[PDB]
Amino acid sequence: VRPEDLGTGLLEALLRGDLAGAEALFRRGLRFWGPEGVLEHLLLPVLREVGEAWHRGEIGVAEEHLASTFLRARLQELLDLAGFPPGPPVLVTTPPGERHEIGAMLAAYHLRRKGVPALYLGPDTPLPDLRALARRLGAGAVVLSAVLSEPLRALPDGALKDLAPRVFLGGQGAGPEEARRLGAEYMEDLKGLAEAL
Amino acid sequence: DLGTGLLEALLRGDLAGAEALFRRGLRFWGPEGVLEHLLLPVLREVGEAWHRGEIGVAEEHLASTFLRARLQELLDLAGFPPGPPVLVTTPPGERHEIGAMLAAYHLRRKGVPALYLGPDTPLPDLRALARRLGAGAVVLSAVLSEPLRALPDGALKDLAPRVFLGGQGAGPEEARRLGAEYMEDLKGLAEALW
Amino acid sequence: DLGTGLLEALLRGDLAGAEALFRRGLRFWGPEGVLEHLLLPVLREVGEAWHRGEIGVAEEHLASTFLRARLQELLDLAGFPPGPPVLVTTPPGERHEIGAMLAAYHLRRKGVPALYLGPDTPLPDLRALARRLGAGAVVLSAVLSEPLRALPDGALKDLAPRVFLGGQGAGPEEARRLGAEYMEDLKGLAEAL
Amino acid sequence: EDLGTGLLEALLRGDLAGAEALFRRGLRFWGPEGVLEHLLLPVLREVGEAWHRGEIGVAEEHLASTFLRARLQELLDLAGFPPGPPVLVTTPPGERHEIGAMLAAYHLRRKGVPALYLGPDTPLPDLRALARRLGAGAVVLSAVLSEPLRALPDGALKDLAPRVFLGGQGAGPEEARRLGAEYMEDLKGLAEALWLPR
Numbered sequence: 001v002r003p004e005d006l007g008t009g010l011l012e013a014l015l016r017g018d019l020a021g022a023e024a025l026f027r028r029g030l031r032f033w034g035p036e037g038v039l040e041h042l043l044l045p046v047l048r049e050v051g052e053a054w055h056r057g058e059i060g061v062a063e064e065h066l067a068s069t070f071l072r073a074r075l076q077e078l079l080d081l082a083g084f085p086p087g088p089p090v091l092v093t094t095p096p097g098e099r100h101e102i103g104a105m106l107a108a109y110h111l112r113r114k115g116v117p118a119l120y121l122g123p124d125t126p127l128p129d130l131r132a133l134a135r136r137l138g139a140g141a142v143v144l145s146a147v148l149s150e151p152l153r154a155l156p157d158g159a160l161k162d163l164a165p166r167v168f169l170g171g172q173g174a175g176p177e178e179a180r181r182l183g184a185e186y187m188e189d190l191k192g193l194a195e196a197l
Numbered sequence: 198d199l200g201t202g203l204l205e206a207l208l209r210g211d212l213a214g215a216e217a218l219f220r221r222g223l224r225f226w227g228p229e230g231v232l233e234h235l236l237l238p239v240l241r242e243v244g245e246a247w248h249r250g251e252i253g254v255a256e257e258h259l260a261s262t263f264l265r266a267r268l269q270e271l272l273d274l275a276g277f278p279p280g281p282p283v284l285v286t287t288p289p290g291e292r293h294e295i296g297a298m299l300a301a302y303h304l305r306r307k308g309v310p311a312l313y314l315g316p317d318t319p320l321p322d323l324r325a326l327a328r329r330l331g332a333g334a335v336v337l338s339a340v341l342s343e344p345l346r347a348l349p350d351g352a353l354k355d356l357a358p359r360v361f362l363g364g365q366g367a368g369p370e371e372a373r374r375l376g377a378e379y380m381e382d383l384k385g386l387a388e389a390l391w
Numbered sequence: 392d393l394g395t396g397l398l399e400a401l402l403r404g405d406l407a408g409a410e411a412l413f414r415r416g417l418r419f420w421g422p423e424g425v426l427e428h429l430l431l432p433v434l435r436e437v438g439e440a441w442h443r444g445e446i447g448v449a450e451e452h453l454a455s456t457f458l459r460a461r462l463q464e465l466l467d468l469a470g471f472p473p474g475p476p477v478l479v480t481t482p483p484g485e486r487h488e489i490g491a492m493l494a495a496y497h498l499r500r501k502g503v504p505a506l507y508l509g510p511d512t513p514l515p516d517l518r519a520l521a522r523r524l525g526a527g528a529v530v531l532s533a534v535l536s537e538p539l540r541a542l543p544d545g546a547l548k549d550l551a552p553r554v555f556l557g558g559q560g561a562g563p564e565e566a567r568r569l570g571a572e573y574m575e576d577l578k579g580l581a582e583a584l
Numbered sequence: 585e586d587l588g589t590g591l592l593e594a595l596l597r598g599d600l601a602g603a604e605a606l607f608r609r610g611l612r613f614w615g616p617e618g619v620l621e622h623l624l625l626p627v628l629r630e631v632g633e634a635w636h637r638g639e640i641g642v643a644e645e646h647l648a649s650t651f652l653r654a655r656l657q658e659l660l661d662l663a664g665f666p667p668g669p670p671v672l673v674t675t676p677p678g679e680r681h682e683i684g685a686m687l688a689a690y691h692l693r694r695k696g697v698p699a700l701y702l703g704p705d706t707p708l709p710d711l712r713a714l715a716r717r718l719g720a721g722a723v724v725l726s727a728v729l730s731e732p733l734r735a736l737p738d739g740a741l742k743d744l745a746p747r748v749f750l751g752g753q754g755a756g757p758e759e760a761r762r763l764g765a766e767y768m769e770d771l772k773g774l775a776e777a778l779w780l781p782r
């Protein structure tokens with residue numbers, strides 16, 4: 001399997017319910033592209049394609065579920081293999097109503113890969129509870145991944161302003177203007193998140 | 198005890214400590230044992246503590262996310278045996294997924310190819326996937342009762358030749374209404390087709 | 392069972408089997424755990440079997456090379472954070488490198504930028520590199536005692552602002568003689584930094 | 585190209601992340617065989633020459649070599665390990681340069697040969713014993729220095745396995761003849777030579 005065919009091979013393995021094969025193809029990608037690379041060049045393209053294929057009516061929700069659940073597990077495995085250093089944590093989650101979690105996981109991963117103690121909470125955290133936990137742990141930052149725009153639209157002006165000393169918002173659902181309205185620092189690239197920290 | 202220590206380590210955001218305590222549990226009780234003696238009690242306690250107002254949603258999220266990751270690791274350790282799969286998910290509207298994962302685990306430990314889909318699968322899409330993979334069975338975990346009451350009579354009938362429904366949200370009457378076989382305990386799930 | 396399975400798989404040249412067993416161990420014990428409970432015991436057993444005359448050097452080589460590769464894979468998966476590095480190597484004349492790799496791994500897993508150099512680094516060259524990179528520490532793994540004895544009193548004193556020595560070849564007395572801080576456990580190395 | 589200089593520069597600044605990104609870029613551009621030919625091999629040679637000229641110290645070479653060995657080992661595992669009678673790959677007694685042997689194992693694996701890399705510096709009787717016990721079809725040796733070959737007696741490599749191949753900058757046709765090994769210049773033609781009779 002040539003690298004440029006790994007994406008289709010992996011999706012095909014998943015759609016035949018061949019998890020073992022899917023795992024082997026993912027690992028080949030990991031060995032070729034490296035950890036950050038396999039996420040960029042294999043995990044993300046497959047997931048986007050899964051979304052487009054669902055939208056065109058080529059696959060159903062259950063096939064997306066299968067693929068997403070599998071890729072989340074692969075990313076979680078990489079996350080546990082990265083360091084978890086000591087010191088004030090960075091809490092990573094998604095806004096209330098946002099159930100797409102892989103962006104948040106990616107953010108947490110890229111941070112840990114740079115030696116930042118990113119605590120991934122899971123998705124969909126109410127803001128008062130998030131604020132309270134950041135406070136109690138002395139969190140240096142809160143990072144939010146927004147895939148959809150609607151959950152940000154549902155929040156009032158300034159809603160993200162006091163969650164932690166620094167509050168970062170990114171993802172396809174977020175933009176500079178909405179981040180300003182909400183009182184968060186906008187971040188375009190995962191790479192520049194650790195730098196900013 | 199390990200249960201309190203693990204919860205305490207999670208609530209301090211000490212993941213390394215939490216991981217070490219979980220591994221100790223795993224090494225002592227073994228795979229099935231650590232679920233029964235450590236993973237399940239901590240999750241229940243997290244629920245009760247939230248309900249009493251002792252912890253907030255972010256603490257529950259942290260603990261649940263951690264334990265889901267540990268259970269997924271056990272799922273991959275159990276292995277994924279070959280042959281026609283058994284699809285495992287939760288009803289539409291059901292976001293609690295650890296019960297489904299548990300079902301998949303117990304099945305895999307008995308050599309059943311339990312394919313965990315993730316939670317919250319619309320029934321037509323589930324039916325379609327069972328059909329395309331030639332699935333022998335479908336297993337649903339219901340933690341809440343409400344998602345089952347929202348479903349039409351007979352809605353679980355014929356998703357596969359065998360359809361099983363269990364969890365704290367499910368009962369015999371609702372399973373009959375929906376056209377599923379009710380199952381009380383995970384232990385008797387692999388027996389039902391074995 | 393995994394230790395015996397893994398050694399048996401290696402001695403039959405079944406690398407695929409060996410890889411699967413190691414991953415099983417990794418999933419069960421976790422990363423630090425699989426090194427402690429699987430990599431280390433297998434390598435000790437390899438050494439004892441060689442010492443008894445039961446296996447030749449080629450079998451040990453096969454097993455060692457395999458386990459080094461597994462550890463290197465884990466090392467690359469750990470973070471490499473920014474900032475002043477910690478250089479990790481072995482004393483001149485020390486060709487057993489897996490202890491050093493372990494030290495680098497445990498450090499990286501705790502967010503320390505441990506640069507593993509490989510084994511067997513002359514002290515002047517090591518000192519020079521620590522200086523030029525502004526390294527906060529040097530860590531040395533000694534498996535044999537002989538490369539340390541050879542060394543003069545206070546040979547390790549100024550390699551970097553902090554210098555740590557550990558491994559089965561090292562002890563408190565020899566560390567004091569050499570001007571290094573002795574460390575018994577890998578766990579307490581990141582703490583000390 | 586100049587990925588080579590960039591990579592060496594990143595290594596000498598202790599920027600492993602940068603070094604890894606440059607290597608990956610090379611791997612994505614040239615492909616697996618290509619990145620070895622265009623990036624891994626040139627950097628290693630240059631490291632050697634820079635040490636010899638007094639421009640870098642031993643610690644810098646160690647850092648770079650350790651890094652590139654790790655990258656090559658990753659490619660080895662990516663080439664895969666096929667079933668069937670193995671080919672044992674190592675270096676002669678006294679030979680501690682191992683990357684040539686790893687390269688040989690890689691090129692063999694990329695052609696579907698189960699090349700078992702032992703690591704370097706294997707005593708000949710022990711190697712012969714292991715080849716025999718595993719039913720190895722061949723042994724492959726990489727010699728970087730000439731001295732370890734010079735130390736061996738006539739015919740020493742002859743019967744290590746049914747076929748014995750010797751290559752590397754330390755080896756030549758006459759020394760291979762003296763030692764009873766088949767000489768091989770280029771790694772690409774190694775699988776071909778092995779599938780063919782002697």
Ligand code: B12
Binds near residue numbers: 044098190
């Ligand atoms: C799997 C999936 C789901 C899963 C999520 C599973 C889970 N537990 O995570 C489930 C089943 C829950 C789901 C449900 C739905 N989702 Co959906 N699905 C996806 C899918 C296929 C993959 C999502 C993913 O992980 N992709 C990877 C994402 C994270 O990559 P990315 O956004 O490009 O992220 C990049 C950057 O943004 C950056 N980044 C991300 N976060 C952050 C944060 C920071 C700080 C920084 C610096 C960078 C950064 O990192 C990435 C690098 O490229 C996408 C398809 C797609 N194109 O994304 C949709 C998609 C996002 N979903 C969509 C829809 C419509 C839905 C539903 C409304 C469908 C429905 N009718 O029920 C629901 C809504 C649920 C909700 N959130 O409330 C649409 C969104 C269209 C839109 N924007 O309007 C998509 C695009 C599919 C489509 N083509 O229609 N979904």
Ligand code: B12
Binds near residue numbers: 237258300336341382
């Ligand atoms: C974590 C958690 C969540 C998480 C889920 C995260 C995830 N999975 O991705 C999140 C944050 C999403 C969540 C949200 C909510 N949940 Co909640 N939470 C939990 C908690 C603490 C653990 C859930 C869990 O892992 N299940 C534990 C399972 C393993 O429970 P169990 O009883 O031990 O299950 C046994 C058997 O049922 C059997 N089994 C399970 N499934 C099956 C299937 C088969 C076939 C068989 C044979 C056996 C079997 O296996 C287990 C053996 O011990 C529980 C507390 C609890 N006691 O369950 C609630 C709990 C279930 N949640 C509850 C509530 C109220 C909610 C919310 C409505 C809160 C809100 N207002 O937003 C939402 C609703 C979401 C939804 N639509 O589903 C309540 C339910 C009360 C009720 N009405 O019955 C609980 C009980 C908390 C409480 N103490 O009040 N929750």
Ligand code: B12
Binds near residue numbers: 439
């Ligand atoms: C593989 C191996 C080799 C390989 C090394 C391959 C490589 N790394 O590239 C090679 C082939 C080179 C080799 C050669 C030789 N070695 Co050898 N071999 C081993 C073996 C089997 C495993 C070594 C290993 O990696 N073990 C795993 C390590 C990680 O375990 P560990 O050292 O106990 O480390 C633990 C602690 O010390 C701690 N730690 C380690 N470093 C540090 C550093 C710090 C700062 C801290 C805090 C902690 C710490 O962490 C680890 C976990 O608890 C051991 C057997 C054994 N029992 O060790 C010998 C062994 C060490 N070798 C030995 C011998 C005899 C030799 C040779 C002299 C044989 C010969 N050629 O004649 C040569 C000498 C080479 C030299 N100059 O160093 C003996 C030494 C006994 C002694 N001291 O008297 C051993 C014990 C074998 C035996 N039973 O006889 N060897």
Ligand code: B12
Binds near residue numbers: 725749769
């Ligand atoms: C890193 C390195 C080391 C490392 C080895 C690390 C390891 N692998 O574990 C260490 C630090 C151990 C080392 C030490 C020493 N080495 Co040194 N170093 C190197 C270096 C840079 C290795 C580069 C390499 O991996 N070569 C492999 C590739 C890059 O080069 P290559 O051999 O041309 O490979 C091609 C072909 O030969 C072919 N090939 C190789 N093997 C095989 C096998 C077959 C079957 C086939 C078909 C083809 C084939 O493939 C390649 C392209 O097609 C070389 C520099 C160099 N130019 O090679 C020296 C070099 C070989 N070392 C040298 C020296 C001097 C030493 C020491 C004697 C120094 C010392 N006094 O301590 C010791 C001796 C060690 C020993 N063998 O006992 C000199 C040799 C000069 C000479 N005598 O001819 C070199 C050439 C550097 C130099 N010019 O100063 N070294």
Ligand SMILES: C[C@H]1O[C@@H](n2cnc3c(N)ncnc32)[C@H](O)[C@@H]1O
Binds near residue numbers: 051
């Ligand atoms: C964005 C992703 O959301 C999933 N999706 C779409 N509709 C639903 C639903 N009602 N319930 C669950 N998941 C759904 C699809 O699989 C799509 O690919």
Ligand SMILES: C[C@H]1O[C@@H](n2cnc3c(N)ncnc32)[C@H](O)[C@@H]1O
Binds near residue numbers: 124126243247253255
């Ligand atoms: C059953 C679990 O659901 C979580 N929970 C309760 N309310 C919400 C909400 N609005 N959003 C997300 N999770 C919530 C709690 O943390 C509880 O422990």
Ligand SMILES: C[C@H]1O[C@@H](n2cnc3c(N)ncnc32)[C@H](O)[C@@H]1O
Binds near residue numbers: 449
């Ligand atoms: C400590 C390890 O050193 C290895 N060992 C012992 N003698 C030699 C030799 N001549 N060459 C290479 N390795 C050797 C053995 O395989 C032992 O297991």
Ligand SMILES: C[C@H]1O[C@@H](n2cnc3c(N)ncnc32)[C@H](O)[C@@H]1O
Binds near residue numbers: 641646
């Ligand atoms: C061929 C390579 O050998 C390394 N080299 C040279 N002398 C020594 C030594 N005493 N110990 C270890 N490595 C050494 C150099 O770094 C050179 O680049």
Ligand SMILES: [Br-]
Binds near residue numbers: 459657
């Ligand atoms: Br390696």
